[PDB]
Amino acid sequence: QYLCQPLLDAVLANIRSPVFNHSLYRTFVPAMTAIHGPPITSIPSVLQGEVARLDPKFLVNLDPSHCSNNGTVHLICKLDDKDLPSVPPLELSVPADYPAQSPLWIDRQWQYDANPFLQSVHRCMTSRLLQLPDKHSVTALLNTWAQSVHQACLSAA
Amino acid sequence: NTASLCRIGQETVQDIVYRTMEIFQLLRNMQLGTYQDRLTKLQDNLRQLSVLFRKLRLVYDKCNENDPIPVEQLIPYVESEERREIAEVNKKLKQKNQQLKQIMDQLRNLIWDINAMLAMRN
Amino acid sequence: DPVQRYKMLIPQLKESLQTLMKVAAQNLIQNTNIDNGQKSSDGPIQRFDKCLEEFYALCDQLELCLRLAHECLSQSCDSAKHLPYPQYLAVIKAQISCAKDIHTALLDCANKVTG
Amino acid sequence: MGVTCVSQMPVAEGKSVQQTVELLTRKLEMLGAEKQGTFCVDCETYHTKLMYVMHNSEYPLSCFALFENGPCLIADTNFDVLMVKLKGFFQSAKASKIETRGTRYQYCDFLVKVGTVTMGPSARGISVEVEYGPCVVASDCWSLLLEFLQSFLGSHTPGAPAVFGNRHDAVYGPADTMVQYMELFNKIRKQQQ
Amino acid sequence: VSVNLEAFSQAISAIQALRSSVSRVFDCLKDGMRNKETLEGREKAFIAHFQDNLHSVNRDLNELERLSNLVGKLYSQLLQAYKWSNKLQYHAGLASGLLNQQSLKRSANQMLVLPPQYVDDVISRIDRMFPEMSIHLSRPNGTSAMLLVTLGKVLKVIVVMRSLFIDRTIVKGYNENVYTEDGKLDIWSKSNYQVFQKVTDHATTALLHYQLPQMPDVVVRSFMTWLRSYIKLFQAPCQRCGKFLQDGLPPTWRDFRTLEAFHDTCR
Ligand SMILES: [Zn+2]
Numbered sequence A: 001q002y003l004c005q006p007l008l009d010a011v012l013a014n015i016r017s018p019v020f021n022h023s024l025y026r027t028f029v030p031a032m033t034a035i036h037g038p039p040i041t042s043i044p045s046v047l048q049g050e051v052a053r054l055d056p057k058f059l060v061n062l063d064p065s066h067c068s069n070n071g072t073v074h075l076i077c078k079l080d081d082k083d084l085p086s087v088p089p090l091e092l093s094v095p096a097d098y099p100a101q102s103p104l105w106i107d108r109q110w111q112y113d114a115n116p117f118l119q120s121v122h123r124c125m126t127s128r129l130l131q132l133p134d135k136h137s138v139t140a141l142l143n144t145w146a147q148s149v150h151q152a153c154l155s156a157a
Numbered sequence B: 001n002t003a004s005l006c007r008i009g010q011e012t013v014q015d016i017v018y019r020t021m022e023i024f025q026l027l028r029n030m031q032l033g034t035y036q037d038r039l040t041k042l043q044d045n046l047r048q049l050s051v052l053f054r055k056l057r058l059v060y061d062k063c064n065e066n067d068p069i070p071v072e073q074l075i076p077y078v079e080s081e082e083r084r085e086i087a088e089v090n091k092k093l094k095q096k097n098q099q100l101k102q103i104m105d106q107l108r109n110l111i112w113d114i115n116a117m118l119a120m121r122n
Numbered sequence C: 001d002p003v004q005r006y007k008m009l010i011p012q013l014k015e016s017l018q019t020l021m022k023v024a025a026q027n028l029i030q031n032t033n034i035d036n037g038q039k040s041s042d043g044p045i046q047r048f049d050k051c052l053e054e055f056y057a058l059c060d061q062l063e064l065c066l067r068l069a070h071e072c073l074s075q076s077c078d079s080a081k082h083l084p085y086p087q088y089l090a091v092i093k094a095q096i097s098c099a100k101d102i103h104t105a106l107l108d109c110a111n112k113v114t115g
Numbered sequence D: 001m002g003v004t005c006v007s008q009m010p011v012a013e014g015k016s017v018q019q020t021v022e023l024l025t026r027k028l029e030m031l032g033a034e035k036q037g038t039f040c041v042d043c044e045t046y047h048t049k050l051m052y053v054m055h056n057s058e059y060p061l062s063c064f065a066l067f068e069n070g071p072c073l074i075a076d077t078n079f080d081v082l083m084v085k086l087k088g089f090f091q092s093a094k095a096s097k098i099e100t101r102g103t104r105y106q107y108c109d110f111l112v113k114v115g116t117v118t119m120g121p122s123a124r125g126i127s128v129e130v131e132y133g134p135c136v137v138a139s140d141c142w143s144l145l146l147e148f149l150q151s152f153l154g155s156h157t158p159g160a161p162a163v164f165g166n167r168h169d170a171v172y173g174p175a176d177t178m179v180q181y182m183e184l185f186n187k188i189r190k191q192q193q
Numbered sequence E: 001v002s003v004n005l006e007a008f009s010q011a012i013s014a015i016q017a018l019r020s021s022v023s024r025v026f027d028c029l030k031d032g033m034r035n036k037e038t039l040e041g042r043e044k045a046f047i048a049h050f051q052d053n054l055h056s057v058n059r060d061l062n063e064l065e066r067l068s069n070l071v072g073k074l075y076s077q078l079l080q081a082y083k084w085s086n087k088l089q090y091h092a093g094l095a096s097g098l099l100n101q102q103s104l105k106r107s108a109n110q111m112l113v114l115p116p117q118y119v120d121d122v123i124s125r126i127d128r129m130f131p132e133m134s135i136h137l138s139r140p141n142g143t144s145a146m147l148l149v150t151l152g153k154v155l156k157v158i159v160v161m162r163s164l165f166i167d168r169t170i171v172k173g174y175n176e177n178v179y180t181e182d183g184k185l186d187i188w189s190k191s192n193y194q195v196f197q198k199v200t201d202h203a204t205t206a207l208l209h210y211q212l213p214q215m216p217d218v219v220v221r222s223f224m225t226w227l228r229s230y231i232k233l234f235q236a237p238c239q240r241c242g243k244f245l246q247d248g249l250p251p252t253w254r255d256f257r258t259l260e261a262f263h264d265t266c267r
Helices: A005-013 A020-035 A045-052 A116-130 A139-156 B002-029 B034-065 B081-119 C002-035 C048-081 C085-113 D017-031 D079-086 D142-152 D174-191 E002-031 E039-070 E075-101 E116-128 E194-209 E217-232
Strands: A073-076 A091-094 A104-106 D003-009 D034-047 D050-055 D062-067 D072-076 D098-106 D110-119 D122-132 E133-138 E146-151 E155-161 E166-173
Touching (some): A005 C002, A005 E039, A020 C048, A020 E002, B002 B034, B034 C085, C002 C048, C002 E002, C002 E039, C048 E002, C048 E075, C085 E075, D017 D098, D017 D110, D017 D142, D034 D174, D050 D079, D072 D079, D072 D174, D098 D174, E116 E133, E116 E217, E133 E217, E146 E217, E155 E194
Antiparallel strands (some): A073 A091, D003 D122, D034 D050, D034 D098, D050 D062, D098 D110, D110 D122, E133 E146, E155 E166
8 A cells, every 4th residue: 555556556557468477577586586595495984973983872884775885875773772672773864965964864654653662752753853953963863862762761651 | 019119219200390390499589698508409409309310210120120911901890917917007096096086176175165265254 | 872773764764665666666667568569768767676775774774773772771671680890890700600600500410410 | 437329319200209219119129129227317407607417317326517518527416405505696497407218228238218308298309328338438439339320220320429529548437428418408408399 | 671672672573574574575576476277366366465465564664663653762701691590580480380380299298386576577578568458467365466457448357377377367348346345356257248258258268279388478478469459349340241240249259360350150
């Protein structure tokens, strides 16, 4: 701005000439080189990060079935915990570009029938799924699953 | 023996750091007879520190002379006349501690009575 | 004097900056008018390089004056930190000897630890 | 001798003085103040220059004699008897007895006394007095009093009585409260309507 | 004075910055426009760098001018010893601070008796500094010294020592009678107000907090340093909520090691 303007006017006047840097060189390099001397002397890794940090309750493994080494990935988890009862395995479909979007829980209504207890597990799980914020992780789904199993143990007894 | 040599070796490293801190405080306070006194204190501290280093190398060599069990095999996860000597001295200072508690209680009560009686005289 | 030399050197510094920027713009415009196809008067073009070294000479004078004044004032501060002239020389040799004693005590015992 | 501040709460432009007093004491009962008794302040003027004789409830054994710009006397209650013993040199100057009556609320070392200024039968204004116990130096805890008055007065918040305006480290005294009360009473007598 | 030292070192760095920024302007102009994929992007980059360099030169010149507005005005063996003394003093200060922050001492064990004259000398030494605090020692009950520390027109603190180590403190207000009927110190009382009972509690945490094991002079000096900060009661606002009053209390908490005001509810 002040005390520097005519340089700025000269250089902004003379941009887009192909001989521009020639002009700068010819007008500036002999002074500088006299004073200053001569010049100088398969699976996306976000999911591996999630699975590597899970609690040893969960036992997440890939589905033998379904497409592999391609966009989306598919998981069959498990649940081991003395406090919690054995439950249906749970099926997850993680999209490619996994963060910035929410994974999907593959619903299997037919195995969550044939007991009152698994029905309570399923109702409570769909409730906490509706309660979830958007763009949640895989671990949010797995933890809502474990909390759903715990509530269905407590509500029953 | 050697399992007290380890304790002495820990105490030497704990003393060396504290002694260097005291040396740096002496060098902080020294303002260009007390000149000579601070000189003597500095030289004596440095002498004692060199003694501590020699003692530390001695204790290191003694404990490093006298391992078949690696560590992390030593932690319990979930899933004979010297014992009688210990029990003897334990019973002895049990009785000594109870007698010391009686002496301490009587001193406390005498102090409290003196302060109460002298507080009320005014 | 160093404050007043500093007040002397400031407007000269602004003048050298003004001349340096304007002369840089003049030389660049002349070289672009030769490099692109343009007529331009030769004239009193007033070389750039002299202005650049003149600015550097003024900055050397400024940093020289300020380093001198800062050394002088730090000097006076530690001198006040520490009336017959032989009494002055006695306490001065006392101070020099005492600092020598601290230094040799530290060196001899830091060598007495190892080697 | 804690720092106090005395002010006039205005009429409110509507309703009775009693209803505005109900509003202020209601706000005080919101904030957590507790009633701890009642208070009365009496002022009379005596003339041959004017002298004032004042009584607080808070200092029940004391009577204050205020000479409007001159010095204040504090004395025991027998001073009143001396005025009855004077009786010819200093006439009583009746129809200028003035009182404030009200309840005193305490809210954590703040004493708030809200009274109704009653010249004879008719009540003609609201006096509000806030005393801050701990502070003993005027103009230092003034901002505390300002925040408390901004908390419950809101608008009509007074500012800096001139007894504070003597700007030193002067220790506040009990005479300054009666000075402020005398200034308030003179303003209400001149307000009249 | 030290402000001239700091202003001169400041303006030294200002000249070095001005010179280097001018040379940086001309060096970046020497190289010329770079390539930068997009043509629009390369024009933008060159213009931005040139403008930033020019602005930095202007800022450095302005700072030099501002310092100009604010500026004010065998023998080598002695100066060498002076420089080496200041160097050793600063070096020892830093190393002592770093080492006593992290001590490895775990226990005093390996493998109180004082003349009252010494206590009076120590406490008079503390009373000589802090000109707004007056400390008046007395010994009504034996060797245990009792101190009245008045503080401005604000506080009266009754400190009850035991062998040159603070034991109990009671903070009362200025007007409050700290004397009994017989004119002795009222060692056992409270202060009729909420504020000063809170400050007694904070003073008891202060004497529980400033505990060196051996040397007691730093303890009493640091306790009086902390106590001196209470002179801005009724004037300092809380550094968390901004206001003066929480539940009708001023900020009674002067925090240790950084004497800042807080309401104790605001921790
Ligand atoms: Zn607060």
